[PDB]
Every structure is written in C-alpha cells, then in structure tokens.
Amino acid sequence: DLGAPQNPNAKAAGSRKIHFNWLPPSGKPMGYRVKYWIQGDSESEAHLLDSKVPSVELTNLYPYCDYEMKVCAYGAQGEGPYSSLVSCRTHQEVPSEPGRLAFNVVSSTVTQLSWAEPAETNGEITAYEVCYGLVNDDNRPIGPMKKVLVDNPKNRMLLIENLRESQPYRYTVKARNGAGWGPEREAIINLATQPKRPMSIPIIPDIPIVDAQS
C-alpha cells in the first residue's frame, strides 16, 4: 500500500493557474489524483485532476482567489491516503471595464458622470481614472484628452461643468488594482441631445466637480 505524497507545495503560476507538486511516496505509484476547490466551497465538490507525474498545473482559475488542494497516489492496491492540505492564492490581474457610463445631464454645459464597479475586479480596486476630450463626428479627438485627478479616486461619480455648448465629447473610465489599470469604458455624448434634469448639491467641502475648460 502507498503512503501519502509528502511535502505538498503550491505556488501561483499566474492569475488563472497554480503549480502544485509533491514528493512521490515510496513504492510504485502509477499516478496521482489531485482534489482542489475554491476556499469557501468544499472537498465534497472538489475538482478532480489526474496526473502521471508528481506535479500538476491547475487551470481556468479565478484571479485573486484562494484555492485548497491535496493529492493522493494510486497503485496496485488502489488509492492511498491524501496529503495534508495546502492553500494557495492566484495573482491579481487587471480589472474588467467599469460599468457602462451613466450621464445625468443638468444643462447644456453640466453633467454628472457615474459608473458601476467592474463586473470582475480581479483584485482590490484602488482607483478609477476619468478622461474626457472633444471629438468630431467620427470619434476623432480634437486636441488631447484630459485626465481628471481627484482627492478620492475610489468614488464612482464626477460632476463636470463648463463643457462647450453643443459639442460632442468622448469620456472614458478605467479601473486600477494591484495588477494595474484595466480596459476603458468609453462613451460619446453631446449634452444638447440629452434630457435635462435639475440636481441638488449639498454645500459641503471637496465636492468632486471638474471645470472642463481649465
């Protein structure tokens, strides 16, 4: 009968892969079976992965996610006992796009911009960046985009005033986590063609309002 594989050891091989290896038990193991699952699920619902060598690469994993796993050998007598558990967390990767940009337009020159958190954060989001710029009718920039800097970049809304009347602008929003900046959500809008609705702004410090012609 085979003993348990020894020194089970796992290391992230990326944001969607883990490398798990162990020492062959003495005897004549024919192969190994690995059980692995997301932290918070269960061994009873484990994924089951066969290997003919004393290592495996776990694939199609979630980014920034803890996985638990263990491994047994099988041989002439069937499966031996499993190794002790190991836990390993995949790397972060950049977030997905923010949600579709929402514009609550106040006037011909003022709009609120807001967006939902990325559907996949793939890590811990530490900031958003909003850019905006004039475009012509083919979404071709007229001059450079402008980057907005704000006191709290984790906020998902911005007020923008002093936009040029009846001109289209491109707006973009992207999100950052520990892996870096993810892809941009873009929208092109002209306030002239939007429904107008009044806004109430509490008279308090640090309102995130951007002057578009400065």
Interface residues toward Cl ion, by CB under 5 A: 14-17
Which of 69, 78, 86, 70 is CA-nearest to residue 29?
A: 78
Which CB, 13 or 127, lies closer to Cl ion?
A: 13
Which CB, 90 or 109, lies closer to Cl ion?
A: 90
CA atoms of 69 and 8, how far apart (whole Å): 9
Which CB, 14 or 31, lies closer to Cl ion?
A: 14
Which CB, 14 or 99, lies closer to Cl ion?
A: 14
Render 28-43 in DSSP notation, one character per residue: ---EEEEEEEETTS-G
Which of 198, 95, 101, 205 is CA-nearest to residue 158?
A: 101
Which CB, 15 or 177, lies closer to Cl ion?
A: 15
Amino acid at 111: T
Shortest CB 7 distance to Cl ion, Å: 24
CA atoms of 155 and 152, how far apart (whole Å): 6
CA atoms of 165 and 99, how far apart (whole Å): 26
Which CB, 57 or 165, lies closer to Cl ion?
A: 57
Dihedral over Cα of 95, 99, 100, 101: its sign: negative
Establish how many alpha carbons lie within 13 A of residue 138's alpha carbon, considering only the half-sphere containing its beta carbon: 1
Shortest CB 17 distance to Cl ion, Å: 4
Shortest CB 126 distance to Cl ion, Å: 21
Amino acid at 135: V
Shortest CB 14 distance to Cl ion, Å: 2
In the block, residue with structure tokens 């972060």: 92
Shortest CB 91 distance to Cl ion, Å: 7
Shortest CB 90 distance to Cl ion, Å: 7
Give me the torsion for CA of 63, 58, 20, 4, rounded to 10°. Answer: 130
Of all residues in the shown chain, the one whose CB is closest to Cl ion is 14
